[model samples]
Target: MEPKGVFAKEQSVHNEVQAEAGTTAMLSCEVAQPQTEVTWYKDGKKLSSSSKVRMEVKGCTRRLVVQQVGKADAGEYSCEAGGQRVSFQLHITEPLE
Candidate 1:
């Protein structure tokens, strides 16, 4: 029997995200199937799971929420699943106090 596989969905502008500094940056990607493994990366480095980073996967949707975004959070972020990858440029800017 042939094994089932997951596929990526049609993404519209999934490669650019902007957020004000000191806020939450929500980044998301979608797949065509369930139970797929997704890995998140920031600036070519694997992201470490922590309280500041909330990862969520439900059905075909995968989300990465970066809380308390700062200047250091601005970089190239990517999500990898089933050999397919989608990346985003996170632009963080300071907000008027």
Candidate 2:
């Protein structure tokens, strides 16, 4: 039987993500439960599904996609749920001027 409160990462997130300016960056992770309530954080602040930053979920997968990445967007990002967490680092590169 499936146990309760057993949220775990089925597909772990990529450890590092590289993106250039005006590009899209996607960070996706999965948990055992599709109903799991997860939060997406950037560095230290909680994020919302805005035009530039989108949060998605497909079954057990939780995803974050950042559009048009800027130089200042590089940082550590994490998703937390039921005390379990998955994290990744974003390294934004500058486009040739």
lDDT scores of the candidates, listed in order: 0.60, 0.61
What digit string (tens of lDDT, one per residue) describes model 2 on residues 51-85? 37766766666666666445565567777776666
Candidate that would win on TM-score: 1
lDDT of 1 by residue, 1-97 (tens): 4333454544342666666766555665555555567766775575444327766766667766676444665567666776666756767665667
**Per-prediction TM-score:** 0.57, 0.56
Off by over 4 Å in 2: 1-12, 28-30, 46-51, 57-61
Q: Determine which window of 10 residues in candidate 1 has minimal summed lDDT.
A: 2-11
